[PDB]
Design a protein around this ligand. Structure first.
Ligand SMILES: Nc1nonc1-c1ccccc1
Ligand SMILES: Nc1nonc1-c1ccccc1
Lengths: 546, 546
């Protein structure tokens, strides 16, 4: 019974094989066949390449030794190497061209999801080249998906030496018959085969996955499109900034590059961005996913006025100040989307670019009280129910698991009537006590929200809705302005409250506005359609937040 | 009795005045005198510029209105504006050229140090230009040094309107006679003068500071060179990463740009880098100042083997992995310096560049046990005293204030004999029970270290010295390597343990090594000579960590 899968890197998890360039270079330069592959393997276990792979020397020290081997081979073959011959240039280009073998990575992800222990076992080097970051980035993207990474240069052992296989088995805490081992080099397969491991010689990926599927009894080929990588809260870097004596803001941080500040809505968490954080960080951004004021590990003062937009925006400016950031891209959803438009209006110098999911930008009407304006739209009745301090807190805090399971549903899973909420007497009046789990969330994800809301409950979050008059007076000061910094509005076809139609006049105030639109998407955009959200945001960031 | 100082921005804290370009542009383009300064002030309180300064419109909306005013003025004056005339280009260049008036900022810093409440009061705009970041950076660098920043566009009021002065006084919680108000515009001085505030018309900085010195009775001109900006722990962003089940690492984080990981020595803190963190972040780097394993808010497991260099380095690689960083520049001092050389040797792909303060790189001698090697140098006797578990812990933990005050001293303040420490029976045997405060530290700084060491004490920190044999065996695997990534070695003339001479052969192993050297500098480099450390590191980072 197999319970562990081991993959090689070159030619298996990453393609084209860096090894493959030697044959290509020979052909392109009309050199005798196998000359470069000979200089490379020269001296076998005692040679320069084995010393490199065991970590005795670095890649930069290996380059002149490989150069020396190339001549010795050329001299024997009675051929002259071309004038401008460069081993450094050949290897720089080969390493740079090598990319993750996405269907192979998908198969490894599926096996791990099914309970398999997975590992990468590779003959690799200590890379000190000026361009080493490209390879460091590839190794980082890949290794996060595996239980173990065993590199020859770190362990002082190489394949096909028998000791590295015993080392692999000791690491896996598994007997050989429990291991599938995948490799593109026949010679490197034999010792694993000799120990009784299941072995797969990898030439083309489809056949290798067919053999892997047949031997494990798990569907790996032709599978449905997987979800983007999520976040495990315990594996994240957690940051904490005091913005004023009684208020601290918590955030999760991942990646390098331009700062991207993600701002969740009601009643959410930094974790509502779980599918976006790894994707945006891998796309070359430094993601700061906030617990907004009133939520999770951030402070939750009880006063209603602590949650007016002016105060919330001022604190987000202080947050940037304390972190030493002159700007960040601000991306918001729901109440977070309203905050990001106001950050763009009041602090354009601190906003690199702005994007909202679902929340439109509608200028305040100075001739209508916000109380009057909310009353006009029947879908906003729940906002009237949220006004009286304590009423909605009591209902939302009674049973947390029920609250989150009732709220977080796809457009075809509704359990609530967002209609005549006050008259009905609550959001959950004709709602099940034990709602079924939505296709959008796991029980584990629901329990994370439950755990977060046990600290402060719903007072602070509900207070975001209790500053209508104050927010209206503040917003009226901005009526003569336009948003002229880069902006993106993302509508969700099936959000029945923040309907796409509400965004129809935004170009009057944001003339250069860019758009995205997601079909068959409800209110909970990030978790409803994470793949599409990621595609839209990454495309926009790369073109406009540059 | 004055207790508050208020400074204008344009022409006072920042020069050349953005206003000053109008006169310059007129002269350069041979336009009639004062034409551009007329189009700018056109319509007075009802005009486009006052609307901009009150925050009614943004700078990008103001540009075509100023353009319209420029023509109306030119038409009246019977002159034609040059063909390629651009208000945007003129203002972009003027804003970009404006820099902090360093002696004015120094005076404000000195007044605050002496107990004054300080503020910036400025007529400014909402900047939505594509180049707005330059100004955001300037405002960030400046505002951190003041109690208040009052911007006309945020308060909807402008100087010389009387309400902004009453608003300033309300903000300062001071009566007018308690306020010195500095401005370069005569008209903007009068309302403050009318209320009874002390006013300084600023033309040239020296005269303005002479008037300021005379009126406050505090020396501001000709003062000694100030120390670099320090860190207030409560104002920093604090980060926490779990690198393994029982181990979390704490760090302070400031700035944007390439990641720079600062690694302190024994028995220190992230706070040992307090003078470097603001300087490096302002120089365009993202600083991550660590609490090393065993210290401060980082985990401190009791096992000796948790502190061998192999384990410590592996955890720092995991730290980068969890933060989503493919590389960081690694800068170390003392034990932190030893760690950074080993990061360069074992993980060059993760090290953008490496720098050490005081700690040299000396390859392990495979023919001498580390016990034998340490014995040879009498200055390393204290390391032998640290070997026996519990002995040095008891002495160092007996009185924390005494420990830190005895250790942290400049080269001419020695209170300890680092000689025959074991034979003597401890580091503090012939040491005062109440050492005098060193010129290097405040009582407040000593108490921060005391507070940090109350959590875990000295077991984990001392364990860094208890892995000699293990570190030697690991280091021997790297003997065939060279450090070929960018490297900087900084020696300190008066470090009597890590003497500059010990670094003399480093070029044999690091051929491209760059150097720095600090005269009259003891062991505690960062706090002994912070200005020189900052100058050396910033110069090197800008040329080599690019
Ligand atoms: N309460 C309101 N009426 O109009 N616009 C608002 C508003 C303004 C800013 C933030 C949130 C809401
Ligand atoms: N303990 C030792 N002998 O030589 N070199 C070392 C060493 C190696 C790595 C880190 C710290 C010390």
């Amino acid at each position: 019974t197999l319970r562990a899968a081991v993959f090689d890197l070159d030619g298996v998890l990453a393609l084209p094989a860096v090894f493959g360039v030697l044959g290509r270079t020979e052909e392109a330069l009309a050199l005798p066949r196998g000359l470069l592959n000979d200089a490379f393997q020269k001296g076998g276990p005692e040679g320069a390449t084995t010393r490199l792979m065991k970590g005795e020397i670095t890649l930069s020290q290996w380059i002149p030794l490989m150069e020396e081997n190339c001549r010795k081979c050329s001299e024997t073959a009675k051929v002259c190497l071309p004038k401008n011959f460069s081993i450094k240039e050949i290897f720089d280009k080969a390493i740079s061209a090598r990319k993750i073998n996405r269907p192979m990575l998908q198969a490894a992800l599926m096996l791990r999801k099914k309970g398999f222990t997975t590992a990468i076992l590779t003959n690799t080097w200590l890379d000190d080249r000026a361009e080493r970051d490209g390879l460091a980035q590839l190794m980082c993207e890949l290794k996060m998906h595996f239980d173990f990474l065993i590199e020859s240069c770190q362990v002082g052992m190489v394949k096909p030496e028998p000791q590295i296989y015993k080392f692999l088995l000791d690491t896996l805490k598994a007997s050989p018959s429990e291991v599938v081992f995948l490799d593109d080099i026949g010679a490197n397969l034999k010792p694993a085969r000799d120990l009784g491991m299941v072995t797969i010689l990898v030439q083309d990926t489809d056949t290798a996955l067919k053999e892997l599927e047949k031997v494990t009894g798990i569907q790996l080929l032709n599978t449905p499109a997987p979800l983007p990588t999520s976040c495990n809260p315990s594996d994240m870097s957690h940051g904490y900034v005091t913005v004023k004596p009684r208020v601290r803001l918590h955030f999760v941080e991942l990646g390098s590059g331009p700062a991207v500040c993600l701002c969740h809505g009601f009643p959410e968490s930094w974790y509502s961005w779980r599918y976006q954080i790894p994707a945006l960080a891998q796309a070359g951004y430094r993601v700061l996913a906030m617990d907004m004021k009133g939520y999770g590990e951030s402070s939750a003062p009880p006063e209603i006025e602590e949650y007016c937009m002016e105060v919330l925006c001022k604190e987000m400016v202080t947050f940037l100040d304390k972190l030493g950031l002159s700007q960040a891209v601000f991306i918001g959803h729901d109440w977070g989307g309203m905050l990001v438009w106001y950050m763009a209006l009041f602090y354009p110098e601190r906003v690199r670019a702005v994007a909202s999911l679902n929340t439109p930008f509608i200028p305040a009407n100075p001739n209508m009280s916000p109380l009057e304006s909310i009353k006009a739209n029947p879908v906003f009745d729940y906002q009237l129910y949220f006004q009286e301090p304590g009423v909605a807190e009591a209902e939302l805090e009674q049973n947390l698991s029920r609250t989150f399971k009732s709220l977080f549903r796809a457009s075809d899973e509704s359990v609530l009537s967002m209609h005549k909420v006050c008259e009905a007497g609550g959001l959950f009046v004709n709602s099940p006590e034990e709602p079924s789990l939505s296709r959008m969330v796991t029980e584990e994800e629901i329990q994370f929200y439950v755990q977060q809301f046990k600290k402060s409950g719903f007072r602070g979050p509900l207070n975001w809705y209790r500053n209508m008059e104050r927010n209206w007076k503040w917003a009226c000061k901005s009526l003569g302005r336009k948003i002229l910094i880069p902006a993106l509005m993302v509508t969700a076809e099936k959000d029945f409250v923040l309907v796409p139609q509400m965004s129809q006049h935004m170009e009057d105030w944001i003339p250069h506005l860019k758009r995205g639109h997601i079909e068959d998407c409800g209110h909970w955009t990030q978790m409803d359609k994470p793949t599409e959200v990621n595609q839209i945001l990454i495309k926009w960031l790369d073109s406009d937040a540059r």
